[PDB]
Amino acid sequence: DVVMTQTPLSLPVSLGDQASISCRSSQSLVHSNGNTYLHWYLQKPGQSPKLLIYKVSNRFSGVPDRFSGSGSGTDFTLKISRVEAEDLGVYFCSQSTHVPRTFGGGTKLEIKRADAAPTVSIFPPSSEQLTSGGASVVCFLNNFYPKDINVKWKIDGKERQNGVLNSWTDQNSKDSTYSMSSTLTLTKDEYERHNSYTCEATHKTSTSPIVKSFNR
Amino acid sequence: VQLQQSGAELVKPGASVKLSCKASGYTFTSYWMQWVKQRPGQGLEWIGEIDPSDSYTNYNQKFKGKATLTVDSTAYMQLSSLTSEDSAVYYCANLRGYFDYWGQGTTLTVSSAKTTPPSVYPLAPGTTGSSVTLGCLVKGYFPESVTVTWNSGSLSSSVHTFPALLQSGLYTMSSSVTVPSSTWPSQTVTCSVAHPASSTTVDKKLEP
Numbered sequence: 001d002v003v004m005t006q007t008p009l010s011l012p013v014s015l016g017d018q019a020s021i022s023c024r025s026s027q028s029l030v031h032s033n034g035n036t037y038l039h040w041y042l043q044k045p046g047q048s049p050k051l052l053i054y055k056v057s058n059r060f061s062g063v064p065d066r067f068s069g070s071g072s073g074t075d076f077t078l079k080i081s082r083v084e085a086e087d088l089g090v091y092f093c094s095q096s097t098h099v100p101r102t103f104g105g106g107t108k109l110e111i112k113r114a115d116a117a118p119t120v121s122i123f124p125p126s127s128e129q130l131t132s133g134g135a136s137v138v139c140f141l142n143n144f145y146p147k148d149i150n151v152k153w154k155i156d157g158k159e160r161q162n163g164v165l166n167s168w169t170d171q172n173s174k175d176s177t178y179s180m181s182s183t184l185t186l187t188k189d190e191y192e193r194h195n196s197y198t199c200e201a202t203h204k205t206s207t208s209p210i211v212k213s214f215n216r
Numbered sequence: 217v218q219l220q221q222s223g224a225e226l227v228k229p230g231a232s233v234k235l236s237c238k239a240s241g242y243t244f245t246s247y248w249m250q251w252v253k254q255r256p257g258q259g260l261e262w263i264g265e266i267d268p269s270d271s272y273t274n275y276n277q278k279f280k281g282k283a284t285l286t287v288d289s290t291a292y293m294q295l296s297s298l299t300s301e302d303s304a305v306y307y308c309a310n311l312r313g314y315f316d317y318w319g320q321g322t323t324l325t326v327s328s329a330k331t332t333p334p335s336v337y338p339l340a341p342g343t344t345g346s347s348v349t350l351g352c353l354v355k356g357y358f359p360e361s362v363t364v365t366w367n368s369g370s371l372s373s374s375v376h377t378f379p380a381l382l383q384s385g386l387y388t389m390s391s392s393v394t395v396p397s398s399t400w401p402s403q404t405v406t407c408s409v410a411h412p413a414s415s416t417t418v419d420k421k422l423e424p
């Protein structure tokens with residue numbers, strides 16, 4: 001069918017600056033009836049897409065003039081004049097000149113903000129889980145920036161590679177920071193053989209690794 | 217104008233399922249009802265359309281014998297011979313220029329695995345700081361959809377909810393909330409976990 005291409009696939013921009021998302025069609029989007037049906041949607045995590053600009057430059061209801069769409073034939077540009085913290089998400093260009101209607105892959109808007117060291121919290125397994133025979137020890141590394149971080153688990157000084165799960169949230173729209181959780185799962189037996197559990201993170205805002213441990 | 221769909225559906229491979237789209241706030245018999253599919257790794261594929269006033273329909277080639285639209289004021293899309301590839305979010309939408317409305321989307325999980333309720337465990341620190349972070353661990357459930365709220369969702373400013381992960385054959389996620397040190401444990405915080413698929417609603421009080 002007609003293939004839409006978006007440039008770039010990810011775009012880091014400072015609050016207050018302008019952003020330009022490109023979309024290109026394999027074919028001309030000019031319909032025989034004269035119109036060019038190229039649209040732009042903004043999709044926020046866990047949300048259905050919402051239309052920003054239809055037919056190249058017309059704004060949907062309530063959309064601010066920060067957003068402007070332009071282009072012609074096969075070349076189209078979506079511009080945001082004042083990137084705002086809650087503008088982050090994935091921008092899709094779609095076309096309905098040709099059947100079937102098709103969409104681009106999406107461009108992820110990422111906000112560039114100042115460095116922030118993560119806050120680390122470590123939690124011992126609860127009595128209720130220990131009771132069931134399992135033991136997950138958790139570590140939350142909240143509100144940091146940039147997203148590049150390394151987490152390491154240590155049991156009585158010995159590094160633990162296996163049995164650990166990591167999950168990170170996407171950039172937070174409120175403060176443009178990231179978060180992550182690292183969970184080390186053990187049996188109630190393994191957990192009870194050792195004393196101190198350490199959660200250690202290395203981030204560029206540190207130089208010296210952030211450490212948080214509880215002795216049992 | 218609101219287009220409401222079912223939140224989720226679990227079906228075994230080889231089976232067939234009917235997803236509804238109840239239209240409200242306008243004249244169904246006007247705008248064509250569209251269906252779009254989106255799989256986690258963002259990329260939307262168009263499926264087809266149906267004219268409520270005719271029942272005239274238009275399908276995308278790739279979904280020729282997969283989808284089968286009908287209307288009634290609701291609109292239905294029925295799929296067939298479900299495979300793992302069919303596990304996606306299915307939206308119904310009215311896409312007519314300035315008249316653009318999408319439903320919430322129905323998450324369709326094609327799997328043989330049986331529904332399993334989650335085990336919720338509290339994460340209380342084992343102190344310190346001007347504010348303390350607390351959390352809940354939702355462990356071993358299926359299918360995916362679980363919602364964690366704090367103080368019935370009234371405590372929402374410092375919450376971080378982390379994405380589910382497959383641990384064993386079940387899902388696992390955690391959620392954190394940061395409150396002022398002086399307020400805990402003087403005031404209690406509770407995390408509520410709702411697993412619709414298993415008709416589960418568990419509350420957990422966070423005690424030291």
Ligand SMILES: O=c1[nH]cnc2c1ncn2[C@@H]1O[C@H](COP(=O)(O)OP(=O)(O)O)[C@@H](O)[C@H]1O
Pocket residue numbers: 031033035037096097312313
């Ligand atoms: O998304 C679309 N793709 C292709 N044709 C469309 C689309 N939307 C409208 N048309 C059709 O082409 C026509 C032009 O009307 P349109 O709805 O574009 O607004 P306009 O008349 O204000 O320019 C109508 O016949 C209409 O049914």
Ligand SMILES: [Zn+2]
Pocket residue numbers: 155156193194195
């Ligand atoms: Zn040891």
